[PDB]
């Protein structure tokens, strides 16, 4: 298989890329949780400012 | 004595009218003293809020 010597170079590049995306979309999902909590802190505080 | 008793009976009425009138001033002044206790409670409520 002459061109399978290139199909490994291609499928290596996709396999190394997709595995970075797989932890990077977990790093983003973690950041979205931390933002959500901090917007809830802003939300909570603007209610205390409304009562003040 | 005719015009001494006339002016003195008018000075009686105009001075017994002061013993009520400056007591009516006093009654109003006790009512602004009572309002100062509310301003002190209210500014203490505003100060803990602004802090």
């Amino acid at each position: 298989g002459s061109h399978m010597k290139d199909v490994q170079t291609e499928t290596f590049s996709v396999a190394e890329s997709i595995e970075e995306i797989s932890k990077a979309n977990e790093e983003i999902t973690n950041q979205l949780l931390g933002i959500s909590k901090e917007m809830d802190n802003i939300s909570t505080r603007i209610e205390s400012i409304s009562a003040s | 004595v005719e015009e001494g008793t006339k002016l003195a009976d008018e000075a009686d009425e105009k001075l017994n009218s002061i013993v009520g009138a400056v007591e009516r001033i006093n009654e109003m002044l006790q009512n602004i003293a009572a309002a100062i206790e509310e301003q002190n409670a209210a500014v203490d409520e505003i100060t803990t809020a602004m802090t």
Side-chain angles (χ1 to χ4, degrees):
Chain A
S2 305
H3 303 280
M4 278 73 257
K5 303 188 174 193
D6 302 287
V7 174
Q8 186 172 337
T9 307
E10 301 305 83
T11 309
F12 269 41
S13 186
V14 179
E16 194 261 326
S17 296
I18 204 67
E19 210 70 6
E20 181 167 294
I21 300 174
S22 188
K23 180 61 191 183
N25 204 64
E26 184 182 59
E27 295 188 308
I28 293 171
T29 296
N30 290 352
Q31 295 287 354
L32 294 171
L33 180 59
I35 296 171
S36 296
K37 295 170 171 178
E38 202 72 61
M39 295 311 302
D40 190 74
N41 272 280
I42 298 169
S43 182
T44 307
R45 293 189 177 84
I46 204 67
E47 188 168 69
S48 307
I49 293 174
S50 296
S52 301
Chain B
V1 178
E2 192 179 305
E3 59 185 51
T5 55
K6 185 188 185 187
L7 276 62
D9 190 83
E10 289 302 305
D12 187 353
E13 185 184 67
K14 294 188 185 190
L15 184 53
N16 190 83
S17 295
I18 291 172
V19 176
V22 185
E23 192 67 68
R24 188 72 189 97
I25 298 171
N26 186 44
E27 178 176 45
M28 288 189 279
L29 288 167
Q30 304 304 311
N31 186 56
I32 68 173
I36 290 291
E37 305 186 66
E38 310 194 5
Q39 295 189 191
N40 287 331
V43 172
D44 195 55
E45 204 62 33
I46 293 169
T47 303
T48 59
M50 290 295 105
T51 307

